[PDB]
Write a protein that binds this ligand. Structure first.
Ligand SMILES: [Zn+2]
Ligand SMILES: [Zn+2]
Ligand SMILES: [Zn+2]
Ligand SMILES: [Zn+2]
Lengths: 611, 85, 111, 66, 66, 183, 46, 260
RNA sequence: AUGAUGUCAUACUUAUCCUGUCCCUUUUUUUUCC
């Protein structure tokens, strides 16, 4: 198989001929670890990645040399990104040598506007007026001019959308629906686009019109085909003025038509995802679950190789936005078609030697797979780790940070099992724990944090006792990311059965209530919750009267949200441990605290009452 | 859009919220609670601890199957925790 | 009594860690056993060995002391026989002996 | 339904349906101690050899397909 | 309940204005010429008050008169 | 061939028009004639969607089992102005039915179809179960014969009917009790 | 909300109602129809 | 709980006030409502209050009518339905259709709640189901079929199967339709009938439909045959008929022909 | 004597609905000073 190494030089030469893309090559070679298993499937997938034409040529020649050696013992798409980055280097470079307003060319001019329009000169002279216009925008604005009106007695054409009804058009949407306005009728495809304005009935109108329209377009899917639809939709779902509802509804029609169309969507897949991937990152939750759903339906609807070969060029894209949302995309498609099918792609990506941004993306993909799949990662956990491990030592920083973070997400979905799979990862991490300043440090603390519950109370005894020091020292950083991490950490480390009470009581609690309990935290949401939880667990170990006894005095504090916080904390605490531990005086302060806080209620909520 | 996950049935007890509390899952009925619900920790984990099998709120009780689904033996299939698609 | 439903063949580890139950075809399940805090027996959640279109002649526990448990499953595949109109796969098809390995840490059952 | 073996459909062939009911009959024979013992009585063999011949006939029965 | 009164009142009004319309063994109204079923007699009556129902009576008129 | 296919079956009558187009007639021939199995309903190849209201408009609304009729609830159930309805709320009277709990503990205990070889299809009601040899009561009354119907005296002379050749009617070749004088 | 397109059923029922009750009682005729008022019934007649 | 402290007149007024609480847009309201209506049904006794239920105009759809139906059920439980049925069965006579299908539902929920006790009343309901299952309009076949279902689960094992076979006759033609609610209804129906009657009779209705030339019949009878197949696959063995062996294949299972 | 095409219209179904819900979108050129 060393002739699969020199043979990797051969394949690199041939595929490089048919330049420089590392990914497809490592995808090709990625079938070697199964060796003697590899089969015709490698022709299918690669069929989409390069030209399906050369596909039969390369895969065929590969099986010949492979079987022989054993016995004796889209391109345009990527071509565009290269030119895009090269122009970026040209312009960026020029300023050093030295936006949307950059002058344009007639082919670029023919690129924007749709079919059926003519360019006009009226004169050569009026054109010379347009050329002097720049000079005369300064010159003739500094000259005599004015307007006036005379009193004289006085046809008025216009168009709404008439036929029978045609529910109303917003003043902007005309640009899209103008073709419907003209009343020319009854004389092929132009009549399918014309009748496809039933979209307008879905967008605006009465709810019944939306319903009936929606069905009518569902049953016409197979008829009209995906091309005309998406051609007439994606502009709308791309509209700058788009509503909330209208968005959601167009999402619905995209789903319902994608329950039917299967082989048809292959050309449009990317052309879909570009609009849809912004749904994954959103403030609305229901928008996110919808988005994940429709990308699931799309990826499963299309083919694996369709998705893969589609989505490569977005990995190295300059903007990180598309890289990120693209990572969540791979998460969704991987939930669709399963981890093992998509593994060799990834495992090829994280070893890409071109540039770091790729590896950063792929690692983020590992993470978002960890979040999405969650508990179900379990079988392939080992292979995944074996992928990610090589980034922890990389020279670039990001890759290290996001890497260890992805380990965190894994272990958190790995809740206790598979400890030895993380095994080889540890020894570097602990070492890094020493030497790091800034965010990466905190990230490591996140990872190690989720790890510790998965270790043995003996090994984790030592290792834990080591983590406690840095954990102490790092309470004081102003970083809120920091405080989140170290907070949840304190939960897991100090919520360990193998930790001694008195040590926490002395070393931890005083700084804990000092720095962590403040009015910066409580006003925030996540910090609020997580703080509640951590405090609850510390109570779960050191006991009740301590924690409560220290936080009672704050029931009487001015602000609400803070009072709400300590109130729900007391609630959960006395919920678990029981009130038996509480002494007398502190109980007087309790009841008085609870009445007092209850007597001033700015909002209506259960927390005070259930409390 | 809404369908069962049907992962293998474990020993974890089902948890229903306020809303779904009385419903037998499959028959949608309140009649004759008899046997008990089991779903996999793959479906029930973490933020899903004591989560509703349906809406996603905290479970205040445990779902009981009807006698109807009992004799038809449907309670023995994959874990009936509904997943949105 | 079913074709795909377990209970047919039954095996267990010498150390009693995990008991493996199996049907004749398609379904081989595993229950892991550990005594509680009081040393009273508690049973885990199931696992899945599922392998499509595979007949199981017999299943026998295997001895590995304090290891990831092993299981000896006699198997055969008829998928070769159904797609072979000639009848060659009726002969020239040998029953595959496979050892599954339970893995506690990874908590699944891999071939 | 699909992942439940024995599932039929409109295109189901004779051969597949009957080989199904065959194999299911054989799993019943492996299942019921008595009926098995009846077989051992009638044609004289061990319980073992009976079950063995059956397990041989699991994949074949009716022979090759069409 | 007010809704119940309308159902009663729109049956009687379609009884007054009313020889073809009837009520089946269920409650629905039917035109015995056209064999159509009507949700409400008035709604049914309009079909009964329509120009198609008219024709099919004439066609059956001729078809009997021959 | 639909011809020769009819030689391979014990009851080839089971083979029908579209049967010759079957993907596996060489079996379906052997199934459809299985001992106790029942035929497929006939409403398909009729495009009428299984029913119309022609014969269904002459049916009675319903009629109770005699066990429920003797009880006496039928007469109890049978009208009201609106203000009497709001008076029926303000006034209200109790115990209009006043059933006998002894009686409705009696009837369904003390006092209280088809076999498998039958299945219903669209238009079938009375006919199969008026036949040559079987008539209704009243028409007996118009005929006025005390307990053969007398034109089966002339079914002696002129011969057995062409229309129902299989015929037997009492006393001639059919060696009769109550109404039914021929089978 | 009440406003909308006129229906053959509403229109025929309007014929019968106008025949029975007479021209000057509109509120009585609007009572039988749904989703229509007395003014609309009168102006729809005339 | 107490229920004695208050005189009956007050109660029946409470009833006539409770009747329109069923316009609630919330499900829990109707919940408590129906259960209460059962309680006061115990406080008074059946006939009057079930008559007051049968007063209902049916005027709107769900949102709700069928809640009144549920009240008819629970009322029929609270004191023996052994009393109540004749009134209802008589009230199917009324020519108004939606209340006819209403009382059909009342039978459905009725058997669902009574369970075992239906070992008697099956007979009483049998001919009426005949009249209902014989189709005036689809909802009759549907709801009546649901009744056959819950009856079929309830009576299981007590030896009444005969009349259930008779009703299965009239059930059987409804197999064909594209309406989702009636087809899924019929599915539930034939499933309950599967467990009650036993598979053998089912399969004897499902044989010929498997291989029939048409696509429709095969689609459906194979759907049914699957429903019969998944459950009780163990008990089907005996009932597969004798199928002769062709050239390349031996279709006779000779094991069953070994004779001592 | 019920085929197809129509955005006419009305009934009807599903103990469906109407109160649940915010929790891992936190994404940037590493950068908090005895
Ligand atoms: Zn699951
Ligand atoms: Zn819920
Ligand atoms: Zn149920
Ligand atoms: Zn008509």
């Amino acid at each position: 198989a060393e002739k699969a190494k020199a043979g990797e030089l051969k394949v690199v030469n041939g595929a490089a001929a048919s330049d420089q893309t590392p990914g497809a090559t490592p995808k090709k070679l990625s079938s070697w670890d199964q060796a003697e298993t590899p089969g015709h499937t490698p022709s299918l997938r690669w069929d989409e990645t390069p030209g399906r034409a050369k596909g039969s040529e390369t895969p065929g020649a590969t099986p010949g040399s492979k079987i022989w050696d054993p016995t004796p013992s889209a391109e345009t798409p990527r071509t565009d990104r290269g030119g895009d980055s090269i122009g970026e280097t040209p312009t960026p470079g020029a300023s050093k040598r030295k936006e949307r307003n950059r002058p344009l060319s007639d082919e670029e001019l023919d690129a924007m506007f749709p079919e059926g329009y003519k360019v006009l000169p009226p004169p050569a002279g009026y054109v010379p007026i347009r050329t002097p216009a720049r000079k005369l925008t300064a010159t003739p604005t500094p000259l005599g001019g004015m307007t006036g009106f005379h009193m004289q007695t006085e046809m008025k054409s216009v168009n709404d959308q008439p036929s029978g009804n045609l529910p109303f058009l917003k003043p902007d949407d005309i640009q899209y629906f103008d073709k419907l306005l003209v009343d020319v009728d009854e004389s092929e495809e132009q009549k399918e686009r014309k009748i496809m304005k039933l979209l307008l009935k879905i967008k605006n109108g009465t709810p019944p019109m939306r319903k009936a329209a929606l069905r009518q377009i569902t049953d016409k899917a197979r008829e009209f085909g995906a091309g005309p639809l998406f051609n007439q939709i994606l502009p709308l779902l791309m509209s700058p003025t788009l509503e909330d509802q209208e968005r959601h509804l167009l999402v619905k029609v995209i789903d319902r038509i994608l329950y039917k169309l299967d082989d048809l969507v292959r050309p449009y897949v990317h052309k879909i995802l570009v609009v849809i991937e912004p749904l994954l990152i959103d403030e609305d939750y229901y928008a996110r679950v919808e988005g994940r759903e429709i990308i699931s339906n799309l990826a499963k609807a299309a083919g694996l190789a369709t998705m893969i070969s589609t989505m490569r060029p977005d990995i190295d894209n300059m903007d990180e936005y598309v890289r990120n949302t693209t990572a969540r995309a791979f998460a969704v498609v991987a939930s669709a078609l399963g981890i093992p099918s998509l593994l060799p792609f990834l495992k090829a990506v994280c070893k890409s030697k071109k540039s770091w941004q790729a590896r950063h993306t792929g690692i983020k993909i590992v993470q978002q797979i960890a979040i999405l799949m969650g508990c179900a990662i379990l079988p392939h956990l080992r292979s995944l780790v074996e992928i990610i491990e090589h980034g922890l030592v990389d020279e670039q920083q990001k890759v290290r940070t996001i890497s260890a973070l992805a380990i965190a997400a894994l272990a958190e979905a790995a809740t206790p099992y598979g400890i030895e799979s993380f095994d080889s990862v540890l020894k570097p991490l602990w070492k890094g724990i020493r030497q790091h300043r800034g965010k990466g440090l905190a990230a490591f603390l996140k990872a190690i944090g989720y790890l510790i519950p998965l270790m043995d109370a003996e090994y984790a005894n030592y290792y834990t006792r080591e983590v406690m020091l840095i954990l102490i020292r790092e309470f004081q950083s102003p970083d809120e990311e920091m405080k989140k991490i170290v907070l949840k950490v304190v939960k897991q480390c100090c919520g360990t059965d193998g930790v001694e009470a008195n040590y926490i009581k002395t070393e931890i609690l005083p700084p804990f209530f000092k720095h962590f309990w403040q009015h910066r935290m409580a006003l925030d949401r996540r910090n609020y919750r997580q703080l509640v939880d951590t405090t609850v667990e510390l109570a779960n170990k050191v006991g009740a009267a301590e924690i409560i006894s220290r936080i009672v005095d704050d029931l009487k504090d001015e602000a609400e949200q803070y009072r709400k916080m300590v109130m729900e904390t007391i609630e959960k605490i006395m919920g678990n441990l029981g009130a038996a531990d509480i002494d007398h005086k502190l109980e007087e302060q309790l009841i008085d605290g609870i009445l007092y806080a209850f007597q001033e209620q700015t909002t209506e909520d259960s927390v005070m009452l259930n409390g | 859009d809404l369908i069962f996950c049907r992962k293998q049935a474990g020993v974890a007890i089902g948890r229903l919220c306020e809303k779904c509390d009385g419903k037998c899952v499959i028959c949608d009925s309140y009649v004759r609670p008899c046997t008990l619900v089991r779903i996999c920790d793959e479906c029930n984990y973490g933020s899903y601890q004591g989560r509703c099998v349906i809406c996603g709120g905290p479970g205040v009780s445990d779902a009981y199957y009807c006698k109807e689904c009992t004799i038809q033996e449907k309670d023995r299939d994959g874990c009936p925790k509904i997943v949105n698609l | 009594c079913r074709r795909i439903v377990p209970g047919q063949f039954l095996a267990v580890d010498p150390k009693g860690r995990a008991v493996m139950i199996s049907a004749i075809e398609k379904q081989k399940l595993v229950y892991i056993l550990n005594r509680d805090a009081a040393a009273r027996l508690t049973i885990s959640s199931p696992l899945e060995a599922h392998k499509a279109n595979t007949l199981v002649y017999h299943v026998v526990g295997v001895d590995v002391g304090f290891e990831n448990p092993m299981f000896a499953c006699l198997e055969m595949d008829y998928e070769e026989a159904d797609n072979d109109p000639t009848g060659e796969a009726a002969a020239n098809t040998q029953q595959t002996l496979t050892f599954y390995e339970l893995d506690l840490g990874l908590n699944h059952v891999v071939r | 339904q699909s992942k439940y073996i024995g599932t039929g459909h409109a295109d189901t062939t004779k051969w597949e349906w009957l080989v199904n009911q065959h194999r299911d009959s054989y799993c019943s024979y492996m299942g019921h101690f008595d009926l098995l013992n009846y077989f051992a009585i009638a044609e004289n063999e061990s319980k073992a050899r009976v079950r063995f011949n059956l397990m041989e006939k699991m994949l074949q029965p009716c022979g090759p397909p069409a | 309940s007010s809704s119940e009164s309308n159902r009663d009142r729109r049956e009687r009004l379609r009884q007054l204005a009313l020889p073809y319309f009837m009520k089946n063994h269920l409650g629905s109204y039917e035109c015995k010429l056209c064999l159509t079923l009507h949700n409400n007699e008035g709604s049914y009556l309009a079909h009964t008050q329509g120009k198609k129902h008219q024709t099919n009576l004439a066609r059956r008129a001729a078809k009997e008169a021959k | 061939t639909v011809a020769e296919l009819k030689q391979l079956v014990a009851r080839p009558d089971v083979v029908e028009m579209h049967d010759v187009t079957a993907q596996d007639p060489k079996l379906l021939v052997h199934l459809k004639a299985t001992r106790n199995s029942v035929p497929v309903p006939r409403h398909w190849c009729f495009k009428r969607k299984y029913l119309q209201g022609k014969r269904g408009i002459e049916k009675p609304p319903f009629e109770l089992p005699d066990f429920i009729k003797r009880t006496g609830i039928q007469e109890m159930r049978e009208q009201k102005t609106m203000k009497s309805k709001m008076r029926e709320k303000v006034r209200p009277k109790m115990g209009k039915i006043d059933i006998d709990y002894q009686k409705l503990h009696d009837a369904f205990f003390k006092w209280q179809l088809t076999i498998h070889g039958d299945l219903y299809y669209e238009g079938k009601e009375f006919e199969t179960r008026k036949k040559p040899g079987d008539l209704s009561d009243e028409l007996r009354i118009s005929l006025g014969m005390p307990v053969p119907p007398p034109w089966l005296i002339a079914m002696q002379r002129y011969g057995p009917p062409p229309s129902y050749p299989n015929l037997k009617i009492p006393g001639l070749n059919s060696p009769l009790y109550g109404d039914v004088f021929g089978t | 909300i009440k406003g909308g397109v006129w229906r053959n059923t509403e229109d025929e029922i309007l014929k019968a109602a106008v025949m029975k009750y007479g021209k000057n009682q509109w509120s009585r005729i609007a009572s039988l129809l749904h989703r229509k008022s007395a003014k609309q019934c009168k102006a729809r007649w005339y | 709980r107490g229920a004695e402290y208050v005189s009956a007149r007050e109660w029946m007024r409470i009833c006539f006030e409770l009747l329109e609480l069923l316009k609630a847009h919330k499900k829990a309201i109707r919940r408590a409502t129906v259960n209460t209506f059962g309680y006061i049904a115990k406080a008074i006794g059946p006939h009057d209050v079930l008559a007051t239920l049968l007063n209902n105009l049916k005027v709107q759809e769900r949102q709700n009518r069928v809640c009144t139906t549920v009240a008819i059920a629970i009322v029929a439980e609270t004191c023996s339905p052994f009393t109540v049925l004749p009134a209802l069965m008589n009230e199917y006579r009324v020519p108004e259709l939606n209340v006819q299908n209403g009382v059909l539902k009342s039978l459905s929920f009725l058997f669902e709640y009574i369970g075992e006790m239906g070992k008697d009343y099956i007979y009483a309901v049998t001919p009426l189901l005949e009249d209902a299952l014989m189709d005036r309009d689809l909802v009759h076949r549907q709801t009546a079929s649901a009744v056959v279902q819950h009856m079929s689960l309830g009576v299981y094992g007590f030896g009444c199967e005969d009349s259930l076979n008779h009703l299965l006759n009239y059930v059987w033609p409804n197999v064909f339709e594209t309406s989702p609610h009636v087809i899924q209804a019929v599915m539930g129906a034939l499933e309950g009938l599967r467990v009650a009657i036993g598979p053998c009779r089912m399969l004897q209705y499902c044989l010929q439909g498997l291989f029939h030339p048409a696509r429709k019949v095969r689609d459906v009878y194979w759907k049914i045959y699957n429903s019969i197949y998944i459950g009780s696959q163990d008990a089907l063995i005996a009932h597969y008929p004798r199928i002769y062996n062709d050239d390349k294949n031996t279709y006779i299972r000779y094991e069953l022909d070994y004779i001592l």
